[PDB]
Design a protein around this nucleic acid. Structure first.
Ligand SMILES: [Mn+2]
Ligand SMILES: [Mn+2]
Ligand SMILES: [Mn+2]
Lengths: 153, 154
DNA sequence: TCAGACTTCTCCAC
DNA sequence: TCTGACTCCTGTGG
DNA sequence: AGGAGTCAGA
DNA sequence: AGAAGTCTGA
């Protein structure tokens, strides 16, 4: 549980609201209990010509990785515990994507209790539905009603 | 002049490095002195759905305007004096676009003397060239060499 | 002449 | 089983 | 920007 | 994002 400086959070929040991304998605996975798994991602995108700016971000946040997919590099943070601690400190400064951040923090906290009952898991998938709604979702496939249909068995 | 908060300039600078833009242009103008107009510009682009975010910027910055361009809206500020005052305070927090700001501040400061001699104007035009190079320039047309062509004809 | 307001275009960086 | 690192695609909003 | 997907080790 | 432009009043 490392603590981040206010000025670092201030600048970064503005960068995240612009070119950053807070993603929640439901992934198909037969080996898991309900054939579906939850993935929370904190994403910052920048062209590889400025990969360095994403590299400092790894050192400054402390945790996370950076990957290239051609002309574009991406800072990513999917690890649950650091994700929570980070978004908790970044949240008050978000102006555009504040809702999504708090919606993720809500999911991460309800992660244990959501593996219990099917109706509870679908309730958490509902929280995922809200995040993609707030985002400019265009390529989404697996939603809460996708889980529901498979969960009719 | 107006003094801006540090928490405001910190966030915004991050947002400028993200979705903001700092432009320098050489506009062709037949009625001008050297047949060319200079236009320094500070832009923030966002989806029209989030126009309210750009609207607040007019309030928090105190100047500037917000127009549409399809599904996209733009916050603009080309007014020479509050632009100098704004970027002067914004610059120390920029990371990705700090060089572009300090060049804009350079041009604006040496603007009145830029009309004296063609050689003093051309030099300022190469300072516009530097700015475009730093930017992800794609569809540019008028450059410092475009001026040189027109000017060295007379 | 000049500078401020306003509109349009386009390619890649998200 | 299950988390997390990793890669790849798509369509705008920069 | 916002998803889709794979895969190995724990 | 980073340009290209028009037009008006002073
Ligand atoms: Mn953006
Ligand atoms: Mn950008
Ligand atoms: Mn952007």
């Amino acid at each position: 549980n490392t603590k981040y400086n206010k000025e670092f959070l201030l600048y970064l929040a503005g960068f995240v609201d612009s070119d950053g991304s807070i993603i929640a998605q439901i992934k198909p996975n037969q080996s898991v209990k309900f054939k579906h798994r939850l993935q929370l991602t904190f994403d910052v995108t920048q062209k590889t010509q400025r990969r360095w700016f994403l590299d400092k971000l790894v050192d400054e946040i402390g945790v996370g990785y950076v990957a290239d997919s051609g002309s574009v590099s991406k800072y990513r943070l999917s690890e649950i515990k650091p994700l929570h601690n980070f978004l908790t400190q970044l949240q008050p400064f978000l102006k555009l994507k504040q809702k999504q951040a708090n919606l993720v923090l809500k999911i991460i906290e309800q992660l244990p209790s959501a593996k219990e009952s099917p109706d509870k898991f679908l309730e958490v998938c509902t929280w995922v539905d809200q995040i993609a709604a707030l985002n400019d979702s265009k390529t989404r496939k697996t939603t809460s009603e996708t889980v529901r249909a498979v969960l009719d068995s």
